[PDB]
Structure 1
Amino acid sequence: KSFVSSPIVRDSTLLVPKSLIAKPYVLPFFPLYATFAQLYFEWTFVYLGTLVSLNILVMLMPAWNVKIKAKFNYSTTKNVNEATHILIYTTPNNGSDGIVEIQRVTEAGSLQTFFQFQKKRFLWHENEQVFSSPKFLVDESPKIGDFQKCKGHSGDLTHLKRLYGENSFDIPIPTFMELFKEHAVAPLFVFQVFCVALWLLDEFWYYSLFNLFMIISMEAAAVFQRLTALKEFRTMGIKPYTINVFRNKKWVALQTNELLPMDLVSITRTAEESAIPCDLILLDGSAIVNEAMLSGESTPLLKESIKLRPSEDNLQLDGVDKIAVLHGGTKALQVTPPEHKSDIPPPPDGGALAIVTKTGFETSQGSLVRVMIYSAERVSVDNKEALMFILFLLIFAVIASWYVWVEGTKMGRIQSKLILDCILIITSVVPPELPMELTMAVNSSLAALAKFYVYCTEPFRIPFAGRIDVCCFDKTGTLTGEDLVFEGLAGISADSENIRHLYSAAEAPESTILVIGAAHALVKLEDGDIVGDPMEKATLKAVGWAVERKNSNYREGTGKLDIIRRFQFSSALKRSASIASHNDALFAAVKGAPETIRERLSDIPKNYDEIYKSFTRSGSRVLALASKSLPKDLNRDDVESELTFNGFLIFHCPLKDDAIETIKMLNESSHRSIMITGDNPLTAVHVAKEVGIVFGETLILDRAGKSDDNQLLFRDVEETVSIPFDPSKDTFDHSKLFDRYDIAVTGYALNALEGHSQLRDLLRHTWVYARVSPSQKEFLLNTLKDMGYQTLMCGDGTNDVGALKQAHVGIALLNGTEEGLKKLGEQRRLEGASCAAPFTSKLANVSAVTNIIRQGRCALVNTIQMYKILALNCLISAYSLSIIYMAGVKFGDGQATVSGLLLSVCFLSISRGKPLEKLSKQRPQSGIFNVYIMGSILSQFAVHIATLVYITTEIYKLEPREPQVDLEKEFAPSLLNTGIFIIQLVQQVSTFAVNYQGEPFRENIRSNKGMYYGLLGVTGLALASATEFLPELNEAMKFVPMTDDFKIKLTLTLLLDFFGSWGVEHFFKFFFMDDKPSDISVQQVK
C-alpha cells in the first residue's frame, strides 16, 4: 500500500484522524464519573482526586511518546488517498520518530501528494506507489557529455519547482509562546508542577508559590537559551542576490532563490559577505576560489573548465575531475571570461558559465547544517542509569513511607490525610534535576570552551574528552608553524669537496635562479595581491623575484621571465613543472621531492644521495630543481623526459613556541602522545625527538632493497646498527627490540605486516608513524579503538577529513592570530571556519588540546559531585520529613521557606569554580553505579540517620507524646520541630561542604570565596540559632526555648556528625576515586 523508500526511514504506516467521541480519554471515563456520582448520592474524596489525576495523566500521555500518540489519536489505514497523516520510523542513527502531515494540491490537472520530513522533500510516484526523495542527476549516473549538451531550463517549470523546491535554507524560528507550550508538556515540568500542587494541598502557601516562581523562571531561561541558538543557526544562510540565469535562450536576472538543478548561471567576483549560491560544476572558464569556509585552508585553489575533456567516452568521476567542482558557501576571488565562442551566447558580464548540480539542503554545507539541527544526538543517549538511580531512591522512599503509615495508624491519625503525607514523602525523595544534569554540565563546558575560540560542532563528544588514553598528532600544520625560513642553496657545486656547502643567495649560476623563479604556482590578482602556498611566497621573496599581474614575472635584477603553461600538483607523482621563456630561447623547469626527481634526470651527480640524506637528517626539508632546454601545448611526459640538476632548496621549519610545553604536559598527565604524519621518516623522527615524544635512540622500519620482496629492515637514523627482519617467517623479539629503541614504523612496513599475528603487539610500542597514506590513518585509528584505547587526533583537516571523524574526538587547528581575532571581535562589537571536524580552534596555538581535555575532565567531575549532592540532600530531607510526620508535628511556612532560601544560596555558589592549570594523573571514572559513589552515598546516609535517630530519642526523652484519638497535624512550637528543623538545615549544608570537589581536579574550597563565605554565613546563622545566641532570632522564628543540657548535646552531635561524614567521604575518595590508566600510558626506557 503506502511506503517510503529512503535511507532515513525504516518503517511507515498511514493514519487517519479519529473523532473526539472515540478518543480513549473521553468515552471510557463517563461511566466511572456516573458511578462516582451515584455512590456519592470523608474517605471518598481521595477517589475523586485519583480519578482526576488518572484522567489528566491519560490526556497528557500522547505528547510524551509518539507511538502512544499514534495509537490513541489516530487509527491506521492502508488507503493512500484518504489518509491525512503518516508516521515515520527513523533509522536508529538518524534523528527520532515523528508524525508529519500529508498535503495535497492540484497542478497541471493532476494532484501530487507530498510531505516534508526533516526538511527533506518527498513526493508520490504513482507507478511505484511509494514516497521517494528527489534524486539528482549528479549522484546516480553522471555522464560528462550530458552536462555539455545541456542548454538550461526552458518553458514552464512548475513540476521542477514542486520536486526540488526553493534554493535556500529553511529554518523557521518559532515564537516564544509556541516553544514554551511544548516545554510545559514535558514530563519533568509536569512532575514538578504536580509536586507543587501537592504542597498546595498540604496548606503550604508561600513555599509552593516561591517554588513555582523559581520553576517558571528556569523554564523561561531554558526557552530563551534554545531560541538564541535557533536564531544563530539562521545566519549560516547566504543572503539572496541577483545573478544571471539562462532561460528561454536569453539572459534574464533572477534572485538566488529561484534556482533549480541543470540551470545555467554566470558567476562573477563574489561580493562582500556573500558566497556562491549552490553547488556548481564549471562548464567553461576558470576561477580561483577560497575554500576557507568549507575546507578550512588558507591556500586558494585553482579551478579549471570541463570543456576540454572528451564528452562521449569519459565519465564524471569526481576524482581526477575534482578541479571542476565549486562547493557552495565558498568565495570566488577571480574569474575569467570564456576565451572562444560556443553555442550559447556569452553572458552580459565577464563571469564564467557554470551548471547547477545540487540546490537547497542537499548540498554539502546544507547537509551538514541539517545533520547539526535535526539528527544531532544528545548527551547520555541511553539514559537508563539515571532512571535506575531514581528507582534506588524510590526503594528507600517506600521503606520509609511504610513506617510513616504504620506509626500514623498507631497514633490514631486519620488515614485519609495520612495517604497524603505518604505521597509527599515518596514524591519528595525523587530529585527532578537528576537526569538533566550532564546536559547542563556539557553546556557550561561548551560556553567556557567557546570563550577560548574552541568552537564545538558535536557536544556529546565532550565526556569522551575527559579521559583520553592516546592522543595522535600530525607533523606539518599542527606541530610546526608554517613560516618557513630559507637557509641556502646546496648541491650546486660540481666538485663538492664539502657535503654541507651552502650558497646563501645571489651566488648560484643563472640557471638555478631562473628555475626557481619559473616553476611556481603564484599569481597576482587584478586588484593586486599575492595568493598561493606560503612556502613559495617565502622562497620567492628570499631569492628576490617579483610576479606581476600578467603571468610574466620579472624585475629580479637578472632579466624578464614569463610562464607560458603550467602543470598541476598532486599527492601522487608529487612534483610541479612549468614551461617558461627567456629572451634568448625557451626552457622548462620542474620542482618536486628529491626521491622522485632523481629517477628522472640523466646525469646523476655523485653526491646526490649523500647530500640529500645529510640535509634531511637534521630538521631541514629539501626540494630538488631541474631544467631542460626545449626548442619551439603538449603532454606532461615529454617536458619531464630528461633533466639537468640545478641544486637543492633547504627550508628550516620552526616549531610552534607552544608545542614543547603542551607535549610535556600531555606526557606527564598520564596520556600517551604519538605522531602520525606523511613526511619521510628522518624528518619525522627528528621532530618527534625535538618535541619530546621519543627519548632515546629510535629505529626505522622500511623496505630493505628496491625490489618489492616485502622484507623489512630495522635501521637506526644513522648507519650504526641494522637488524634484518622477515614478516612471513620471523617474529618480533620483545627484549631485543621493544625494550631499548621505541621503534618508528613507515607506512610501507605497516602495509607489508598486514595480517601478521603480532600486529596488535607491535602497535602498542611504536610512537612515530611516517609515510602513511591518507587511507591507512583510518585503519590505525580503528585498530586503536578496537584495542580499547580512546583516541584524540588533531590535524589541519583539509588533508584528512575522514580520519578525524573516526577518532573519538577530533580537533582541527586552523591558522590565525590573536591580534587579528581581537580586531575582528572589536569590529563586530562596534557594528552590533572549518566546519569539517568535530572541534575547531580558530587560533593556531596547540594548547587547545590541553584546554579541551581539562574542560571535559571538569565537566565529568562536576556531574559526579552533583549526583552525590542531589541524592544525599533528597534522602536527608525525606527521612527528616518522615521523623516529623510519624507524630503530629509539621513545619510551617516561614521555616520551610527559609530552609529553601538558605539552600538555594549555596546552590548558587557551588556551580562556580576555576580549574587548575596543570592536569593531574587521576582520571575520573564515568558511570553512575560504581564503588565510590554508592559507597559514599550509603555510608554518609548511615551517619546522618544515626545522628537523626539519636537526637530524636533525646527529644522524645525530654517531652513524651501520648497517642491521641483522631490527631490532626498542625504547626505549634515544640522541641521536636525545633530539633528536627535545625538538624535538617545543618546537615544539608554539611553535605554541601563535605561533598565539594577536591583540589586536584578543579580547585580547593578555600580558594573561591563565593562558596566559602556563603557556607560560613549559613553555618553561622544555624549555630546562632542552635546555641540561642540571639534570643530575637529564636523568638522571631518560633523556636521553643531549649534546656541548658540539650543545647550541648545538639551542638556536639552536629559538630561530630560533620567530622564523621568528612572522614568517611575522604576515605572512600582516597581508596576508590581514580580508575587505573591503561598499559600503554607508562614512562620507561633502558
Structure 2
Amino acid sequence: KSFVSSPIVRDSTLLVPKSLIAKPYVLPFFPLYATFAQLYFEWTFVYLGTLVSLNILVMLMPAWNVKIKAKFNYSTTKNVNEATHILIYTTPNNGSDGIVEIQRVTEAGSLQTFFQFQKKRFLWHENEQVFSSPKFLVDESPKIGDFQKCKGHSGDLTHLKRLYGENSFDIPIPTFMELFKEHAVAPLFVFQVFCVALWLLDEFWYYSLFNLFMIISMEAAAVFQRLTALKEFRTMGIKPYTINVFRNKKWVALQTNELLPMDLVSITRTAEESAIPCDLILLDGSAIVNEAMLSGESTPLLKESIKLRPSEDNLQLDGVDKIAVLHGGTKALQVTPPEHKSDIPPPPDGGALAIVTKTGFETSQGSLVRVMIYSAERVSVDNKEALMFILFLLIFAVIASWYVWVEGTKMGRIQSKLILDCILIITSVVPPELPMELTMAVNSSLAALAKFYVYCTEPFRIPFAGRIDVCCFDKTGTLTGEDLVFEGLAGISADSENIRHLYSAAEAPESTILVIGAAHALVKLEDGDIVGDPMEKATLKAVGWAVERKNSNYREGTGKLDIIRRFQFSSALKRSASIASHNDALFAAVKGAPETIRERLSDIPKNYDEIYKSFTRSGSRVLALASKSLPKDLNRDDVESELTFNGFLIFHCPLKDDAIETIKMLNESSHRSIMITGDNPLTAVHVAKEVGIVFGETLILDRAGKSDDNQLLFRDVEETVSIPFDPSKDTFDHSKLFDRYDIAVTGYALNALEGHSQLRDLLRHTWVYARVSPSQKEFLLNTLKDMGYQTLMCGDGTNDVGALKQAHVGIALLNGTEEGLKKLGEQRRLEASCAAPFTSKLANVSAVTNIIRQGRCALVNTIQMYKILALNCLISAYSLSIIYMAGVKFGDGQATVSGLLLSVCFLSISRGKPLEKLSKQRPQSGIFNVYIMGSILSQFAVHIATLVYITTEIYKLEPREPQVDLEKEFAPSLLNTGIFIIQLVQQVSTFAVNYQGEPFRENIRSNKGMYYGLLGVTGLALASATEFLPELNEAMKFVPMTDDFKIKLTLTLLLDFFGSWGVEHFFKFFFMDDKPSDISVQQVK
C-alpha cells in the first residue's frame, strides 16, 4: 500500500493496459446494433440517433476525468515488473491527479524503474520496493568536515546523471496543433459543437455556420493566450554559459548543464544577463552578491569562506553559518581569488572556489518556479455555485419544454419532430461561457495593471484584492523616501548644558570622526564605483571620508584607515561592528540602535537617556556610536563586551510626495490602515500622525523600568500622563483607554503579553507597532488572518519577507526611477523579483490604490456578466417556446440578423473605464445572494408578462386552428413578426438596464462606443417596428401590421424597459453592497 513515497503523493495503484475487445464500449455495443438491425428488418430513427449519441459520448468520457480513464482503459495489478502505467493521487494542496508512464532503461547491468511527475524525478529502490524522490546531503545531516573534505568527482558518473539529472530548467512549449487537440476534447467545446449540430439538423444553415466560425475563433484565441503565457514563463531560464570544473584532479571547461551536487566549480564576475548557476557554498575566497531576486533589495551583501570554521565538531547550520551560502539566481558583482595555498591547485581563472549543493528544480528559485507553473490554484476551482445556477436554469427550461410538448401533441404535430424542438429549447437555455467567466476578467485586469509596472506572479489572488478589510505598511523604504539628509551629531560633549545641541562637522574630536570611518560596509568595486546603503554613503560623504579600491578608506585629511574584519548586521541584532587599524594602534567600532547600545558600553552618560528622546520626538532618526581601544580571529561577545561613548547620528526622513494622498484615500475608502516599523515608537508615532493614521493623542506600551520585571506602563508621547498596567492581574479598561487614545504597541510589550486572554481584544484597536523583529511581524499577520480579516502588506525589503508571504496579497516596492526605466525602454527598442506575490518597479506608493481598484473592477464586472448572460438565455428560451408551440418558426436570415445585432452589443459592453476615486460600497462575492436572484427573477417576470400580453393580442387578431400533421414551415405571419421584434428589443434592453453602475467603474454616457451601439440598435429595431421605412420590412419578410396593433406593440416595449430599469435600480439600491467590518469605522474621540 502507498507504493510511491513522497509528500506530493497520497496513494497510488499500478496499471496495465487492455485491448480493444476488453474496452467497455466496443464489445458491449455490438448486441445493441444487432438487435436494432433485427428489429428494423419513422419513429425508429430517434432510436438509432440516441444510440449513436450514447456511443460517441462514452468514447469521449474517459478524457474528462482521470479516474474514469483508469477504470475504463486500465486494470489494476500488483506486479511492479508487469505494470506499464502508474496512477498518482495527489495531496490536497499540490496540483491534481494524473496518469504517468513507467519507463525502463538498463545501465551497468541493472534495470532502473523511474518516471517523472510534475518535473520532480522518482526512482525504484529495490530493498524498500518504493518510489522515492532523490534527496541531497545538505538537507538531511550536514557535516561541516565533509564539505571541506570533498575533492571533486572522478570516474564514470552515469548513475549520478540518472539520479539527479541535468542541471537546468526543463520547460517544453508545445506546438499549436497539440494544444488545440488537447482543448478540443474539453466538455464545454464538445457541448457547443453538439448544440451547433442540432441547428444544422434543423435546416438552419447560415446561422449554424456563423456560430461555428465564432466558436472556432474563440478557441483559437484562448490557445494563443495560453501559449503566450507559457512562453512568458520561460524567461526565468538562463542560457548555459561555460565555467571551469575540477574533475579528474585537474581543471576542465564544462557548460552549466553538466553539474551535479558536490562538484567543485570556480565562479567569476557574473556575465551580463546571467546569474549564479545553482546553490553553491563557499570554500575559499570572497564575493559580493546582490540578493535582488530572493530578498528584493539592491544593497549588496558580503560573503566569506567556510575554511576558517572548525571542521570536526561543528555542524552546518544555515543560521549563523549563512555567510557562506550563495543562492542561485543572484548576480555576483565581484570575487577575490584565494589568499593562501592549499592541496588543490589554483583555478585557471581568478574566481573563488565553491561547492555545489542542489541542482535544477530543487533549488529555491527553481522550486518557486515549479510551484508557480504547475501547483498553482486556478480561480474558482470548486465551481459549485455555477453548477447550482445551471441546474436552476435547466429546471426552468424543463418547465417550459413540458408545455411545449403538450401543445405540440395537442395541435396534431408528429412527435418525431417535436422531440427535437424540446431538445433545442433545453439545450438553448444553457449559457456556455458561464464557468469560464471570472478567468477572462482576471486576465484583462492583469493586462491593464502591467501598464503601470505592477507585475503579478500568482494571478488567483486578484479577487482577494477587491475587498480588503485591513492593510498594513512598512515605515522606512515604503512610506519614507530612500534619500536621507544628514542633520548633525549630538550629545558628543559630556557637559551637555544644552539638550538640543548639534555639532555640524569638523567640530567633534578625532574619536568620533575615526569611529564613523571605521564602522561602515561600503566597498569600491574593481572597475571603479561605490555600492552600499544610501544612508551610509550620505553620512560618509557628509563627514568627509573617501573609500579606495582596497579596504583602506583614507584621504580625509586625518590619516589612512583600513578595515581588517567586519561583522554582519542583522534584523534581530540591532547592531553592526567593525574592527579597524590606524597608523598608531588598533581599535574597534560599533554602531547600532541606542536602546541596545546603552546596555553594552561601560560609562553611561548623564544625559544619554534624555538627548535621544528629546531628538526622536520630532521626526529625526538616531543611531549610536561607540568605540573601544584594543591592543594586538576572535569571538563576537568580546569586541562588544564593554565600550565607550562617542556621539549620536541624527538623520532626517523626507516623506514621499505620493504617501500623503494615498493614505487619505484609503481612510476614506472604507479601509483601515496600520503601520509596522522598526524604529523606536517616537518616530513611528510621529510619522503615523503626520500621514494621517492617528489624529489625536497617542499612548505607548513599553517596559516599566530597567529591570526585566515584565510590567507594562502606558506612557504619553510627551510624558504628561502615566498609567500603569500589569500582565498577570490587570485587564484593559475599554472606556478609559481604548476610546480616548488609540494606543500604539511596542514589540517588547507584545512579547510579554503572549498567551494573554485579552490579546485579541487589544490587537483590534492599536494602529501603530514599533520595534518588532521579523518573527513578530509574521505573528501579527497570522493573527490578523486568524480573526477573519483579509490583509494587504506593502513592504520595502528583506526585513519582512516572511510577513509578505503570509498576507492574502503582498506587494514589494522595488526602488526605481522613471527616467531610468524610460532610458532602458528606449535602449530595448533600439536593440523579475519573485520575492512576493506581486511586484512594483516604480518607487511610487500609488500601487496599492491601483491594485485595489483593479480587483474591485474585476469582481463587479463578473457580477454584471453573470446577470446579463442568465437573463438573455432565459428570454431566448421562452421566446423560442412561444413560437414552437404553434407551427411557425424563424427563418435563417432573421436569426442571423439577430445574432449580429446582439454581437455588436457584446463587443462594446466590455469596454469601460474605472473611476479614479474609490467608493465606499464594497461588492460582495458569490453567485447566490438576495441581489442576483431577486433582480434576475423580477426582470424575467416583467419580460414574461409583456410577452404573454402581446401573444394574447396576436392570437386575438388572427386565430389559429389545429391542422392534422403540422409541419414547421417558415412563412410571414403576425406571430413571427411580433415575437421576433419583441425578442430582439428585450435582449437589447437587458444590456442597457443591467450595465454596471457609476460608483464602481463609470456611467453609460461617458463611453461613446456602447452608447452609439445601443442607440443605433434601438433605432433600427424601432424603425422596423414603426414601419417608418418600407424597404426594410419588405426585404426581411415582415407582414404589414394594423395601425391599431403597432401602438400597443411599441407602448408595451417602452413600458417593459421602464419597469425593468425601475426594478433593477430598486434592488441595486437596497441589497448590493455588504456591510464593512467593525474594525474599519472612523470613530471620533
TM-score, normalisation: structure 1? 0.99
CA contact (8 A) 1:617 1:682 kept: yes
Give the whole-Å Cα distance in 1 for the aligned partners of 2:904 and 2:188.
23
CA deviation after TM superposition for structure 1 residue 653, in Å: 1.2
Tell me, in whole angstroms, the C-alpha distance in 1 between the residues paired with 2:265 and 2:228. Answer: 35
**1:408-487 residue pairs with structure 2 within 5 A?**
408-487=408-487
1:285–1:352 contact (8 Å) kept in structure 2: yes
SS at match of 1:245: strand
Unaligned runs of at least 5 residues, structure 1: none
Secondary structure at the counterpart of residue 281 of structure 1: strand
Determine the C-alpha separation between the residues in 1 that align with 2:849 and 2:139: 41
For residues 573 and 2 of structure 1, the distance between their equivalents in structure 2, rounded to whole angstroms, comes to 47
For 2:637 and 2:1063, locate their aligned partners in 1 and report how far apart those are by CA, in whole Å.
79
Q: Secondary structure at 2:432's aligned position in 1? A: coil
Deviation of 1:569 (Å): 1.9
Q: State the match for 2:959 in structure 1.
A: 960
Q: CA deviation at 1:329?
A: 0.9
Q: After TM superposition, give the deviation of residue 28 of structure 1 in Å.
A: 0.6
Moved more, 691-700 or 598-607: 598-607
Query: What is the match of residue 32 of structure 1?
Result: 32
Deviation at 1:171, TM superposition (A): 0.4
Partner Cα distance (2:247, 2:773) in 1? 46
State the SS of the aligned residue for 2:87. Answer: strand
Contact 1:865–1:995 (Cα < 8 Å) also in 2: yes
Q: Is the 8 A contact 1:2 1:129 kept in 2?
A: no
Larger displacement relative to structure 2 (674-683 or 343-352): 674-683
C-alpha distance in structure 1 between counterparts of 2:386 and 2:639, whole Å? 70
Q: Deviations over 1:821-860 (max 9, x none)?
A: 22222222332x3202111111111111111111110000
CA contact (8 A) 2:2 2:10 kept: no
- C-alpha contact (below 8 Å) 1:797/1:837 kept by paired residues: no
Moved more, 1026-1035 or 636-645: 636-645
- Range with bigger deviation, 641-650 or 707-716: 641-650
Q: Contact 1:2 / 1:79 at 8 angstroms: preserved in 2?
A: no
Shift of 1:227: 0.6
1:1006 counterpart SS class: coil
* RMSD of aligned residue pairs (Cα, Å): 1.2
Q: Is the 8 A contact 1:243 1:256 kept in 2?
A: yes
Q: Secondary structure at the match of 1:982?
A: helix
- SS in structure 2 opposite 1:929? coil
User: Is 1:79 equivalent to 2:71 in the alignment?
Assistant: no
Change over 3 Å in CA distance of 1:456–1:705 after alignment to 2: same
Using the alignment, how far apart are the partners of 1:517 and 1:457 within structure 2?
42
Secondary structure class of the residue paired with 1:694 = coil
* 8 Å contact kept, 1:2–1:78: no
The answer to whether the Cα contact below 8 Å between 1:463 and 1:860 also exists between their aligned partners in 2 is yes
In structure 2, distance between residues paired with 1:631 and 1:312: 31
Give the secondary structure class of the aligned counterpart of 2:446: helix
Q: Deviations over 1:500-558 (max 9, x none)?
A: 11122232222221221222111101111111111111111111211010111122233
- Tell me the CA shift for residue 755 of structure 1: 2.3
Q: Name the counterpart of 1:1034.
A: 1033
| Contact 2:804-2:810 within 8 A present in 1 as well | yes
CA distance in 1, matches of 2:140, 2:639: 38
Instruction: Answer with 997-1006 or 770-779: which moved more.
Output: 770-779
In 1, the alpha carbon distance for the partners of 2:783 and 2:19 equals 58
**Higher alpha-carbon deviation: 857-866 or 448-457:** 448-457
1:335-364 Cα offsets, whole Å, 9 max, x none, are: 011111112111111111101100011101
Q: 1:308 to 1:774 in 2, by over 3 A?
A: same
| Greater displacement, 575-584 / 1062-1071 | 575-584
Inter-partner Cα distance in structure 2 for 1:1012 and 1:813: 40
Gaps of 5+ in 2: none
Q: Is the 8 A contact 2:913 2:1002 kept in 1?
A: yes
Question: How much has 1:2 moved relative to structure 2?
Answer: 7.1
Instruction: Please tell me whether the aligned partners of residues 304 and 324 of structure 2 are also in contact (alpha carbons under 8 angstroms).
Output: yes
Give the paired residue count: 1085
Bigger mean CA offset, 846-855 vs 748-757: 748-757
Q: Secondary structure at the match of 1:723?
A: strand
- The alpha-carbon deviation at position 975 of structure 1 amounts to 0.6
Larger displacement relative to structure 2 (686-695 or 774-783):
774-783
Q: 1:659 to 1:759 in 2, by over 3 A?
A: same
Task: Indicate if the aligned counterparts of 1:143 and 1:314 stay in contact, CA closer than 8 A.
Answer: yes
Q: CA–CA distance in 2 between the matches of 1:630 and 1:374? A: 57
Cα offsets for 1:302-347 (capped at 9, x unmatched): 0110111111101011111111111111111100111111121111
Change (3 A) 1:637 1:295: closer
CA deviation after TM superposition for structure 1 residue 633, in Å: 4.2
Identity, in percent, stands at 100
**Structure 1 residue aligned with 2:1069:** 1070
2:382 counterpart residue number? 382
Per mean C-alpha deviation after superposition, the further-off stretch among 833-842 and 1069-1078 is: 833-842
Question: What TM-score comes out, normalization by structure 2 length?
Answer: 0.99
Whole-Å Cα distance in 2 between the matches of residues 262 and 633 of structure 1? 29
- Residue 924 of structure 1 is matched in structure 2 by 923
Aligned to 1:879: 878
Q: Do the aligned residues in 2 keep the contact of 1:525 with 1:549 (CA within 8 Å)?
A: yes
In 1, the alpha carbon distance for the partners of 2:636 and 2:836 equals 36
What do residues 701-727 of structure 1 show as CA deviations (whole Å, max 9, x unaligned)?
111112222211111111100111112
User: Is the 1:23–1:72 Cα contact (8 Å) retained in structure 2?
Assistant: yes
Preserved contact between residue 86 and residue 100 of structure 2 (Cα < 8 Å): yes
1:379-410 per-residue CA deviation (whole Å, 9 max, x = no partner) reads 00210000000000000000000010000001
Deviation per CA, 1:258-292: give whole Å up to 9, x if none: 11011100001111111111111111111001111
Could you report, residue by residue, the CA deviation over 1:982-1015 in whole angstroms, capped at 9, with x for unpaired residues? 0000001100000000000000000001100000
Deviation at 1:643, TM superposition (A): 3.1
CA contact (8 A) 1:797 1:804 kept: no
Equivalent-residue separation in structure 1 for 2:883 and 2:900 (angstroms): 21
Shift of 1:797: 4.4
Is 1:1057 the counterpart of 2:1071? The answer is: no
Quote how far apart the aligned CAs of 1:614 are: 0.7
Distance 2:643 2:523 in 1: 26
* Contact 1:815–1:844 (8 Å) recurs in 2: yes
CA distance in 1, matches of 2:954, 2:769: 73
- Separation in structure 1 between the aligned mates of residue 437 and residue 493 of structure 2, nearest angstrom: 70
Deviations 1:804-833 (A, max 9, x none): 2222111111111122222222222332x3
What is the CA-CA distance between 1:34 and the residue it aligns to?
Answer: 0.9
Is contact 1:815-1:842 (8 Å) kept? yes
Stretch moving more, 944-953 or 677-686: 677-686
What SS does the aligned partner of 2:638 have?
A: helix
Contact 2:288–2:332 at 8 Å: present in 1 too? Answer: yes
Separation (CA, whole Å) in 2 of partners of 1:501 and 1:1076: 53
Residue 1044 of structure 2 is aligned to residue 1045 of structure 1: yes
Which SS does the other structure have where 1:451 is aligned?
Answer: helix
Residues 572 and 773 of structure 2 are in contact (CA less than 8 Å); yes or no, is this contact kept in structure 1? Answer: no
Deviates more, 1:894-903 or 1:625-634: 625-634
- 2:702 is paired with a residue whose SS is strand
Secondary structure at the counterpart of residue 626 of structure 1: strand
Equivalent residues of 1:454, 1:842 under 8 A apart? yes
Greater mean deviation of Cα atoms: 634-643 or 977-986: 634-643
**Does the CA contact (< 8 Å) of 1:2 and 1:14 recur in 2?**
no
In structure 2, how many angstroms separate the alpha carbons of the residues matched to 1:55 and 1:766?
66
CA shift at 1:773, angstroms? 2.0
Is the Cα contact below 8 Å between 1:121 and 1:134 reproduced in 2? yes
After TM superposition, give the deviation of residue 889 of structure 1 in Å.
0.7
* Cα contact 1:124–1:131 (8 A) shared by 2: yes
Check the 8 A contact 1:453/1:843 in 2, yes or no: yes
Superimposed CA distance per residue, residues 406-463 of structure 1 (whole angstroms, 9 cap, x where no aligned partner): 0000111111000000000000000000011011111111111111111111111111
Distance 1:278 1:923, change over 3 A: same
The worse-fitting range, judged by mean Cα deviation, of 275-284 and 618-627 is 618-627
Q: Offset at 1:1067?
A: 0.3
